Amino acid sequence: SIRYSELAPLYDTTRVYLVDNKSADIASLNYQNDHSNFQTTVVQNNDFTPAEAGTQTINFDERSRWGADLKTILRTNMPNINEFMSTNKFKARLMVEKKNKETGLPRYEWFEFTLPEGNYSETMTIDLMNNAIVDNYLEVGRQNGVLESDIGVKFDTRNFRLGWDPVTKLVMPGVYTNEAFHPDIVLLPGCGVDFTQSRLSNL
């Protein structure tokens, strides 16, 4: 017997509805809550203000153990590159200066790059992460001394050995095939890519 203190008992089985619509009067309880951490009101008596209810308990007889099949609905606007997912973040060890006067050798560092959030294709991403490597180069690497041939992290998608002739030992079209095979990376001496705190290693 699903005893509700106002109406007659509704014996047997029923349905409780927890809907995302705490927008009428239960919105002084969900001020700091989102559509995923909210406080509904499962009491739908259409004679009490949504707040005058929500102080009335649904009571099923206590001589029995009550089960209930939960069946849920859920939408999402979640994109690709958002930060919550930990996408849009990667670290790269990238040259900051050719011939550091202290050592006469290049000086590499560990910069954390950040792509603009939003839902991108699989290419526009790998071009947005190339537009961050070649966008920190403009501020740390331009005015410290490094040729564009020193950019040492380039997310490429070719199979660079297409044309490679074993006899001659080098590709013999005079160019790379520019046909996408896989997102692979292309590094240089010292430079690297760290995906520990990141999640682009999946995308």
């Binding site: 044309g163 002739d165 006899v167 001659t168 013999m172 079209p173």
Partner: peptide
């Protein structure tokens, strides 16, 4: 030398 590539 036969560089099979057409060129």
């Amino acid at each position: 030398f036969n560089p099979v590539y057409p060129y």
